[PDB]
Design a protein around this ligand. Structure first.
Ligand code: CYC
Lengths: 162, 172, 162, 172, 172, 162, 162, 172, 172, 162, 162, 172
């Protein structure tokens, strides 16, 4: 679980050492950033339904075949649309977790690890998800550090898919 | 391992939910108090040798059978190991205080420690005595008003105590 | 060489991953703390002479025998006093390095690693250096974060010797 | 490895001297520029996949012999390894930008790399052309004036370029 | 592990006896129909991904709790492990069909699997449902009369189903 | 590499022993099979242009968006169409090599190993290639052992892609 | 256990892959050879008593001192002549097993492994058995592939003993 | 390592081409002679102990200084190592004959072997004499018309002899 | 492991006392008669092959079910394992005799052995009969008055016997 | 445990070998020495009180401050002096043990291993003990081999403390 | 190599230890035994000719077939009798080396390691050599320790061959 | 390695000869003086710490450039490594005196040491000076007539001196 506090402890322990000024500076950096990050998680959470449905439509508009082809890996029916909205909601929810923890840890453990096998196995296209992520990025309406950190996690996800 | 932030995140994920406003505020309150938490960590760490050596000496003074020939702390090798365990448990305690969650302490240190002492013939009850002594000394150091901006560390002190207590309970 | 910046890179590299928000927050903590460390180092530096001679004297006072016994490991002659002031000068210089870098790395590498063998081989008591370090703590005259970080390193060396 | 700070410290220990006032001012200057430095690391990292893929595609379009049957980047295994080296080098470059020193890059990535390529028959010079492409793309990304507090990042951009250039000089 | 031949041999050695004509004729029988056995192996293997994915999709649609947040197949890593187990089990079954003996499946796959799931909290019951679905799809694939020399594969089909059944009963 | 003869030798060498009746039977299996396999490779080779061209059209027909989207990963232009026919040509060629060797060996070494990273990096959909492979199975016109073996390699590739 | 089917599966399993055309050809080879092998096993079996007793006499006559010397490792009494014929019968039985499994595996597992320690501890000469094995070769009366495979095992035992 | 098939495949892949009718026909030809190839393998293998022991004994009788005290083949450990080298070279030669390609012999046995002897002080020229003796005995065995279907194995014999010669050249 | 001297030392250290008169004297007696103890070690060791082989042979003739097909001593590998166990036990008994303390035998050979045979299916009662045979053969060899300065070895005979009995009891 | 008989058995067991002339000569060496060593142990035991109080007094004479300073690590009070005599009693007892076992083993196991940690943690100075050990050497009154062996152990302890 | 002095050093080096009383006692054992061992080596050497020729005759008397059968492994011709006398002489020489070194080392290094492979390969019977060794034990004419140590190496060889 | 005995034995084996009578007599004379040899080992080992530290301190006093900042013996780690090397060399020299042969010293200590120092930048001449100081000090401890049976150890001292000189020459 990659977060400032967690890795600080982990490194000290792997070295059999007590925490020193280095790990304390790590915590300082974390607690300072937590203010912009925690507020960012809130902003994203309040616009969740909007961001999710908007991201879904952006994907449907860029890849029209996804609301037409009848295969189970697509969203031509209501079942597929819910799967898609659900998935996109998952990505958004992981982003809020990352902001809360101040690291990619939540996303790495619950979503990224294994996603390749899932997309391949169920024939889901990474490009669909990337488009959804670009949309959230362009419409979360954040600014300041909040924007930078949230975008860092959205781009992280994009990188993990390409 | 979990830190205070990740602890809340893993519980929310299990329910597939985002953190409520109350949950975030709670974490935010912890952030506001963070400076005190880091002083406690720095204070216990900067006095680790003293805390271990004074507590160890006190332990052997209150339970002479430990250093009497045949005792589990008798012979240099066993004495060094005993002092080693004191430093280790204290180290993991400060880790828990730093992370704001007992998981590191429980998983990497306490987990199966009772069984270890039992297999070695090491008196667990006496280990707990040494840990309890470190607790008293650690908390006093953390609560010393000298050289630090005045304020309330009451809550943090209870949290620190609970980690030392978890340690004592794990070995007895 | 344990410092926030090199440790952040070493973690990432050991995991084969690019730097993320976690390592960036580690840098934020480091650069925020730099003010204290730089001021503390610069202050200790200008006051090095009185701190060194004063520290040496603090030791001779707590251990009057070190200024009477004939052994080459003692400071009864000018030769021993010089070796002593030199060593204490070394500890102080390392403390400034740790403050400059925001970590114990410098001291760990140039002083602590192997100090045991040295003190045992030449029969130098760790207690002597502990007292010297105590003196520097009570006499650098720094305040706030500068003082706190300066003391953490001073207490770090003390713990290394006991 | 070294970071900007320990690099100076190590030079000072060789002379047995404490940093001069001039040396302290310079490091303080780096500290005061640190926000721009971290933006550079976030911006490059946030676009690593695009920087690597776009550069690779361009390199292959310019040098078709690399992907033609028999070419060093022909067959999936070799292409993948080639894509990996691009990523690898970019990753270490970002490491040097963050630390403010090229040691991690030279020490763990470029040392012995030419010998590695000579032994494999890999046209290191072509790796250089590729790195060069990642450089200009990365610099354009760092220099993007939109969505950021205006300011001059000339020195930093020059520093970032030097890290890419070291990589090119290491395999050329 | 044992194959149909070595299985009878090991039992004969325990008796210090050479195979009877009855036992040898039996083995000749298997040898005479080995083409059918090998088609089964090729046919199930050639459709492994389809068999696994379709059965996994049907299983989750049938047991939504498995993929509800907090469910055992929830999170990418658990879903991946689940799909991997389906494929692993299918693979060991094809081995048994090829070897004409269930030992490899039993020894390397099923032995201790119930204990594994029980310890992880993975519903073995649900795993059995998945296995049974792959069984159904696998057999229909083996029994497809299209593009193959007509003949009787009834005995083979029973042997194959028995291995799938061993798998279901091993985790239930 | 995975082929009868090569694995027979590799396994015996790893055990440090001379070849025996077991490996000789492997060879008997390979040489017997080699007859139909070499004829199958010849058949596939003489019809290569038609199979490649037909397979590409089959893909564009199933996924028409690939002939329309403007990104470099698609075949909207001549450059993309040539890359695609080229890649399909590679799959077919690999299939001929597998028949020649009597094992997936050549395809594993030259195409399978690393394919995942390639497809993810250049955003190429495994689905596209799977449709191409199905076309080849449905149109190579082979029969008997030639077909069973040829199809085993075509389905092997499809499995690695899903 | 060195046999076609078992090694084919073993190699695939060690590679974590499904069986492919390679392992199938290995099986084809085994099943093809089994026709000659199983019959050869039947033949050796009906001629067993004659081969075994005849082989034992061959040894006694080639090495007459084996029935003169008094130690327990020799055949100067019925106990020793029986142990001997028993052993020869063990080699012959192993050969039939090898013909049945299509490999040395059975002989390797039940007889070859440890044989050198047995012959040394009990002071049994490898030479005695080699003569017995040569006798069985010259007297089994097999023909075609049945003879070739059987002799490969008889010679394999002779090579393990020299 | 390559076998007769993958050898031609690798060359064709470097050119990015599918085998030509001729190349395939040349392969069909070897497939038609494969029975002889497998007899050669079995015959040499089945007489391995004899080939090595007679060749070694002949070598020593021919070169008494090899076994005299102080000689390289003196002392049991060195005598065993020498016999082991003989068997090893023979083993890898049969591999080449089986696979129908010298690569396995070259890559795993011959490569670097001359340097090993130079270092050890082992007379490479003497090893070649030993190898040459095994060759002659090995060919006579393969060429023996007794107990085998009559036919021509001249080409195969020529191929077999070339592998032995490689081994000789590799240590001279 | 402990030898005679360190065995008494560790017992005394536990009491924090220097050896008593009765303790040092016991050791002095061992020192004074140590020549015979070494003769017993040399004698048993010099007849290891004979003692093991003769005892194993008697055991098998006495219990034919051990070597009959299906028996635990049947097949070359199991027979080799059984002979090895006999040799291993005899080796550790001579060790105990040489050290003048059974700890090495107990700690490294007998400890856990009964469970080992139980899980394998090896008749421990049979192993005991084998050990008993080695015991008497070993004793007669130690007591042979030929080729040795005449004297009394009765005490040593009892010590030796006791280590063998320990082995018997350990698997009976 | 480093003692003649124990090391002899350990090597042998380590090599899976029965004992031979080499280990028997080791025993010979040990038993030859034990004649003198066991009596030496007796001599040291009989005058233990004398040696211990004398050695403790020798340390206080060389380092008079150890009877001044109030710290728990010093001997200004009866508790401290009692700790000191105990410690010195321990060194003397180990020496008798070594003479008895014929090796440093007992001392290595019960006192040497970890001594550095102890002296560091409780701030006890190795030099103090070195003086006690020098006293025992000069006052044990042993002669011949009893003296040589005994002194080898005292010097062994001194070497471990410096 | 297995010898008192060599093992003593190896064990200590293995432990990173200076030599101590234990190793000195090992040497005392070696040097004491050396007096008898060196004279024994000297006595055997002086009667090597009658011991070798005598032991060879001992082998031929017990195993008469060895002076009659034709193989190159037998002694029916002068060539074979010379190979035999040569081998027996090697054994005798190794025994003198062991007596000189004070351990089986020489024999282990120069004769025993690999002797199994030699005898099996050249079809030489361990029994022939065992008889030669027994003949030397009974006829060397040594007394006291010289005989006991020599006899230990002779039986050591016998054990290694059975 | 070789000791005084095996050195002569290995040379004899190479010639396939038994030691001459004169050679055996020399080994007997060496045995007759073994007590002196063991006293030397005991004495040097017993003063190892003072021999090392006194030589080292003297060396640093003579070559202050070694300990000055930037010097090769500067920093605790380098100083410790330097003291360690002194001890290592001394240790191997005592091994050679004990074994009565320089092979242990040459093979496990001096071989390749000059190259190690060359690569590190460690001044070998300075090491030689340190070794020379240990030699002189060790020889004085060996020749000390106090508390030992009076006799002539000049031969032994010369041998000991020759080992120290080997080490000096190996690094000069
Ligand atoms: C030159 C080095 C100095 C010297 C040596 C010298 N030593 C002896 C004799 C003996 N040395 C020992 C040694 C030991 N006994 C022990 O118990 C131990 C520890 C385990 C050791 C190392 C022994 C037993 C003897 C024999 C008895 C005795 O004490 O004499 C001699 C005498 C001749 C001989 O070789 O035996 C000599 C000359 N003498 C000097 O004057 C040197 C400066």
């Amino acid at each position: 679980m990659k977060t400032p506090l967690t890795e600080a402890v982990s490194i000290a322990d792997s070295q059999g050492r007590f925490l020193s000024s280095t790990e304390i500076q790590v915590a300082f950096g974390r607690f300072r950033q937590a203010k912009a990050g925690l507020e960012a998680a809130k902003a994203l959470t309040s616009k969740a339904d909007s961001l999710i449905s908007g991201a879904a439509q952006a994907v449907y508009n860029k890849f029209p075949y996804t609301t037409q082809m009848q295969g189970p890996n697509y969203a031509a029916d209501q079942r597929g649309k819910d799967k898609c909205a659900r998935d996109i909601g998952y990505y958004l929810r992981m982003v809020t977790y990352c902001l809360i923890a101040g690291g990619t840890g939540p996303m790495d453990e619950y979503l990224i690890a294994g996603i390749d096998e899932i997309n391949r196995t169920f024939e889901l296209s990474p490009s669909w998800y990337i488009e959804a992520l670009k949309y959230i990025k362009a419409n979360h309406g954040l600014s300041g550090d909040a924007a930078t950190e949230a975008n860092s996690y959205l781009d992280y996800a994009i990188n993990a898919l390409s | 391992m979990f830190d205070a932030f990740t602890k809340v995140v893993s519980q929310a994920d299990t329910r597939g939910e985002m953190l409520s406003t109350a949950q975030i505020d709670a974490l935010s309150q912890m952030v506001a108090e963070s400076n005190k938490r880091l002083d406690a960590v720095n204070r216990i760490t900067s006095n680790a040798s003293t805390i271990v050596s004074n507590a160890a000496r006190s332990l052997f003074a209150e339970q002479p059978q430990l250093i009497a020939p045949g005792g589990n702390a008798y012979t240099s090798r066993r004495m060094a190991a005993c002092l080693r365990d004191m430093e280790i448990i204290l180290r993991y305690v400060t880790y828990a205080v730093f992370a704001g969650d007992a998981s590191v302490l429980e998983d990497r240190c306490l987990n199966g420690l009772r069984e270890t002492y039992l297999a070695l013939g090491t008196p667990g009850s006496s280990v707990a005595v040494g840990v309890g002594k470190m607790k008293e000394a650690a908390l006093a150091i953390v609560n010393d008003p000298a050289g630090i901006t005045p304020g309330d560390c009451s809550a943090l002190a209870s949290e620190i105590a609970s980690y030392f207590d978890r340690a004592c309970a794990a070995v007895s």
